[PDB]
Amino acid sequence: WRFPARPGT
Amino acid sequence: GLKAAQKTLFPLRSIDDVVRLFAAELGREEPDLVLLSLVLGFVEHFLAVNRVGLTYFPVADLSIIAALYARFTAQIRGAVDLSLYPREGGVSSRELVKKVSDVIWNSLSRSYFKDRAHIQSLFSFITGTKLDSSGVAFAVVGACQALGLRDVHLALSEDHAWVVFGPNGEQTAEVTWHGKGNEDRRGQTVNAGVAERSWLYLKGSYMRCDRKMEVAFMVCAINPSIDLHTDSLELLQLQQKLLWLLYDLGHLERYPMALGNLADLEELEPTPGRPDPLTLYHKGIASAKTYYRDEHIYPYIYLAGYHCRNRNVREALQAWADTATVIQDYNYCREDEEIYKEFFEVANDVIPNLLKEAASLLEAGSQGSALQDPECFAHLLRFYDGICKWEEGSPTPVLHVGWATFLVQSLGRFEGQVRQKVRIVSVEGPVLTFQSEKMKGMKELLVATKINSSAIKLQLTAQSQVQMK
């Protein structure tokens, strides 16, 4: 799960 | 709720029709966050979640979108009686904000996986009764706009979301959860977290959105993922076009992470006549320096990742050193684990694999190698220095012996003749000044032909003894 606009994958 | 002028573009039959809707809303006194999130969620559902029957674009009919809109406004207006919470001065009260947060919270499914993709939008909240962490914060702000609460706005750090409100917009309130297995603080200010100098609250240098920046957030929240191997081209295109619209109107000026996201999208599929990815990464760093005291980490991690992907070792090392130079002035606190993981992976996986390839290429006769450039060795040292300084004063340690073998191996990738050319000076050629006590004590170990592995380990960690036998 990635916080919006966090870099990388 | 929906005004006649908001309805004239429907049905939306293409990406460009969605863009036109966003342009129209951004031209209004306030863009309608509920409308826009419902539209994005609808098209994401039919482009990423369920593509059965797709032939071009999932047409968004007014009847469908208006009924979703009605479901949301009915559920907020029915549950939040504004008469119980009088507003002086166009300012909302903490009790009112907490009531809206409770309404959203209490609507959610009892049990669900909170880390899933595609649960960020009001379409997910209405159709699935599911939201992710930051999606709850957004939904609270969209509910407050629907109620006429013009002072309630989204606040964003690099890993969390809350709201600002009240007289002069100076109040803060938690409205969602953060992470896994942390204790809820809904209703409280963010002042303890600011005061403790954690990364999570950016020493107070967090983003306070206006409504246009709230639109930018929902655009950054688009998730083009279909599965682990496959992205929706349609949703990538949509996100990229919407970010350029926001950029041209000025609404990314104060949003570093959105600028990095747009740079990433341009690298994947460049738009003719637009700035290069590097220009955009540097604009993101400039935004953080201008508006946020140069206290943000991800503008530098965006840049470093671009250099890493392009096997620019020198510039990747420089950008990671610059990353560390930001973190050094924070205290590592209990809910900062995401940025710990980012530094750990860089030190203990990404840099090692970069230097291993560089070593093979040097063996094959590469010229201008990072491994022969003392300025590159100095960047590596500055990266570790910032991490060590970060640890000083922190309530929880950062370094452990699991870091030390990677440090020794990375140092060793540079020959002694290269390492000797960096002059470490105390407060010609590269000059470096260490801020951390750990690196200052490390200095005399850094120029020997064969690094004293054991001594390095002792200096990097709390360990002060060697084995008894």
Author numbering:
A (entry chain B): 7 to 15
B (entry chain A): 2 to 53, 74 to 386, 399 to 460, 547 to 588
Excerpt from the publication:
pmcMenin, a 67 kDa protein encoded by the MEN1 (Multiple Endocrine Neoplasia 1) gene, is a chromatin adaptor protein that interacts with MLL1 (Mixed Lineage Leukemia 1, also known as KMT2A) to regulate the expression of multiple genes, including HOXA cluster genes. Menin has been identified as an essential oncogenic co-factor of MLL1 fusion proteins found in acute leukemia patients. MBM1 binds to the central cavity of menin, utilizing Phe9, Pro10, and Pro13 as energetic hotspots, which occupy well-defined hydrophobic pockets, and positively charged arginine residues (Arg8 and Arg12) that are involved in electrostatic interactions with the negatively charged binding site on menin. Importantly, recent clinical studies found emerging resistance to Revumenib treatment and patient relapse as a result of somatic mutations in MEN1, leading to point mutations of T349M, M327I/V, and G331R/D. Understanding how these mutations affect menin structure as well as the interaction with MLL1 and current menin inhibitors will be crucial in the development of a new generation of inhibitors maintaining their activity against menin mutants.
To understand how these mutations affect the interaction with MLL1, we tested the binding affinity of wild-type menin (meninWT) and four of the most common drug-resistant mutants, M327I (meninM327I), T349M (meninT349M), G331D (meninG331D), and G331R (meninG331R), with different MLL1 fragments. Further structural analysis revealed that point mutations in menin occur in a site that is adjacent to the MLL1 MBM1 binding but has no direct contact or clash with MLL1. The M327I mutation replaces the side chain of methionine with the branched isoleucine comprising a Cγ2 methyl located 3.6 Å from the Pro13 side chain of MBM1, supporting no steric clash with the mutant. Since both M327I and T349M mutations do not change the charge around the MBM1 binding site and do not introduce steric clashes, these mutations have no impact on the affinity of MBM1 to menin. Interestingly, the M327I mutation has no effect on the affinity of MLL1 binding. We found that the binding affinity (Kd) of MLL1160 to meninWT and all four menin variants ranges between 0.5 to 2.6 nM, indicating that all these mutants maintain very strong binding to MLL1. Recent studies found that one of the most frequent mutations, M327I, impairs the activity of Revumenib through a direct steric clash between I327 and the inhibitor. However, activity against menin mutants is significantly reduced, from 5-fold for G331R to over 100-fold for M327I.
